[PDB]
Amino acid sequence: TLRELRGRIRSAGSIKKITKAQELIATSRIAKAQARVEAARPYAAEITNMLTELAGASALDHPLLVERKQPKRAGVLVVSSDRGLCGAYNANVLRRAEELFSLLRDEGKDPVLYVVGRKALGYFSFRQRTVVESWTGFSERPTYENAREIADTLVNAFMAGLGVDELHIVFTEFRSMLSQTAVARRAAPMEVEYVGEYSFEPDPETLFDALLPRYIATRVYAALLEAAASESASRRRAMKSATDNADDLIKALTLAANRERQAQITQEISEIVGGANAL
Amino acid sequence: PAIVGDEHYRVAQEVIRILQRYKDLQDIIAILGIDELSEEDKQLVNRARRIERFLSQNMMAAEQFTGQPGSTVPLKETIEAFDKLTKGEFDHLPEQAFFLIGGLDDLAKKAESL
Amino acid sequence: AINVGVSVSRVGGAAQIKAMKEVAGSLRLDLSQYRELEAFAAFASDLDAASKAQLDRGARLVELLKQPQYSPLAVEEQVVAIFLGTQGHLD
């Protein structure tokens, strides 16, 4: 009846305002997140230059550069949003996480799971696997003081070999505003790549052993900033989609509400005139 | 259950409950897609969309239009198929596999090609 | 502006010459699955090389089917025009 359709049009006409607002907000926050990525990049480029130049003089025998004799149990970090409305973002992450768990169990390892963000924590609490630790309330704006705690926990779990034999991260790479993907990569043990061809205080072995945990902290930080820029770009896309779906709904409901106006009037006129002609 | 037996009736009630819960969510699905839903709902919708498609069949009459041959399935194979779909034994196959099949062996044969 | 999903012929391929029936006979379902793949891919964050090839074929089949006003094509020319698309010579 017309009243239900007038109610559904009032409803959808409000949703279209709220989703068009969050498309415009997400269109600003991807510019703030890209500004923070490009501001964080200069540190990581210089730490890489310093780490390679130390590795050139070092023995290359730090625990994070040597594989275990028989690995059984691998650590994985998944990162995810603290809000909803993202669209595919959490699903793409969690499908890659399960695709990775089915790689690890196909090599013969079992995963132990660390989680960033309340959405993945909700998923790995519906499916019955444990979570070793988790962190929430910063995926919308990561700060290095969080990446520090994540890297310390993961590196202290690797260096305990309860303990783990490897470290992986699952996150999304922002490639461009129109395209991004979930990626899974091994953070530890690290591969050493020889390529064709200083003072150190107090020694190169000592600095290399004190620098690698700080490199791991900057690499997990760079991944968290890519995850937060990508979340906002996925939110923008999912909110443009929700606005265009609401605009097609207001159109279809209006084309139904008019057909019901016209039928109601014609039925009322048929009922009046049939009475007037009976007399 | 007195005319069709319990092993039929339980399957027919479980399919209806799933398609009903999906037909209630259609108001949200139309705006926000699948990804907003809670996991107790998103599990259900992912088998509702497969049950919905698996109620399709390639009929003997349609052969003169599609060029595909027709299919008949016995009742016992129908009950065994929808019992496995509602429990979840086919949840990993893509939705596009389920169109115009017929029985379970044809489901397997089609799903192997995708 | 033919809607290729909602249009139908309930006489069907009883009245279509064997050349056209052979060459074009797949085109309908190929365009319908392209139309849903295009409705998905308008918001797809990453795309596979198989879907990207099928989506590009679909777009070149939609550009193939259109024609200007008052230009009827004989069936002996229609079949060659659809052959270019369906056999992939437009790729």
3-state DSSP of B47-93: HHHHHHHHCCCCCCCCHHHHCCCCCCCCHHHHHHHHHHHHHCCCCCC
Test mutation, A11, A124, A126, chain B, max B CBs within 10 A: A126
**C-alpha torsion A81→A85→A86→A91, nearest 10:** 80
CA C38 to chain centre: 14
User: CA A144 to CA A3: how far, in whole Å?
Assistant: 54
Range of the domain at B101: 1-114
Structure solved using which method? cryo-EM
Query: C25, B67: Cβ pair inside 8 Å?
Result: yes
Contact between A87 and C43 using a beta-carbon 8 Å cutoff: yes
The verdict on A90 touching B (C-beta cutoff 8 Å) is yes
Amino acid at A158: F
Q: Are A81 and A90 spatial neighbours (Cβ–Cβ below 8 Å)?
A: yes
Nearest 5°: phi and psi at A168? -130, 155
| B61 in contact with chain C, both atoms CB, cutoff 8 A | no
Resolution, Å (one decimal)? 3.5
Number of H helices, E strands in chain A: 5, 5
Which distant-in-sequence residues (6+ apart) come within 8 Å of B21 by Cβ? B41, B44, B48
Beta strand residue intervals within A80-155, DSSP E: 110-116, 133-135
Give the integer Cα–Cα distance in Å for C4 and C24: 13
| CB atoms A180 and C43 under 8 Å | no
Which of left, alpha, beta for A231 (phi over 0: left; psi -120 to 50: alpha)?
alpha
Contact A165, A109 (CB under 8 A): yes
Quote the CA–CA distance of C27 and C5 in Å, as a whole number.
12
What kind and span of H or E run contains C12? none
Subunit contact A122:B39, Cβ cutoff 8 A: yes
Query: What distance in Å separates the CA atoms of residue B6 and residue B9, rounded to the nearest whole number?
Result: 5
Q: How far apart are CA A80 and CA A114, in angstroms?
A: 11
Q: Is B65 on the interface with C (CB under 8 A)?
A: yes
**Cα B105 to Cα A193: distance, rounded to the nearest angstrom:** 51
Q: What is the dihedral of CA B16, B21, B22, B25, to 10 degrees?
A: 160
Separation between Cα atoms, residue A119 and residue A94, nearest integer Å: 10
Distance CA B6, CA C55 (A): 47
Neighbours of chain A (3+ CB pairs under 8 A): B, C
What angle is formed at CA A241 by the lines to CA A239 and CA A246, rounded to 5 degrees? Answer: 95
Chain C neighbors of B67, CB-CB under 8 A = 13, 25
Residue of A89, A179, A243, A248 best to disrupt the C interface, most CBs of C under 10 A: A179
Distances (CA, A) of B66 to A111, B72, B104, C27, C79: 48, 17, 21, 12, 20
Which residues make Cβ contacts (< 8 Å) with residue B11, sequence separation at least 6? B79, B82, B83, B86
The closest of A124, A150, A137 to A223, measured between CA atoms, is A150
Chain A touched by C39 (CB under 8 Å) = no
Residue C42 burial (CB count, 10 A) = 11
Q: Could you tell me which residues come within 8 angstroms of residue B47 by beta carbon, excluding any fewer than 6 positions away? A: B18, B85, B86, B88, B91
For residue A166, give the nearest of A157, A175, A174, A176 by alpha carbon.
A157
Instruction: Identify whether C10 is a catalytic site residue.
Output: yes
Burial class (CB within 10 angstroms; exposed 0-12, middle 13-18, buried 19+) of A142: buried
Instruction: Determine, for residues C12 and B67 on separate chains, whether the beta-carbon distance falls below 8 Å.
Output: no
Say if residues A224 and A146 touch (Cβ distance below 8 Å).
Answer: yes
Write out chain C residues lying below 8 Å of A179, CB-based.
Answer: 45-46
Burial of residue A9 (number of CB atoms within 10 Å: 0-12, 13-18, 19+)? middle
Neighbours of C, requiring at least 3 CB pairs below 8 Å, are A, B
Cβ(A229)–Cβ(A37) below 8 Å: yes
Residues from chain C that touch B64, judged by Cβ atoms under 8 A, are 12, 14
Neighbours of B82 (CB within 10 A): 19
Number of domains in chain B: 1
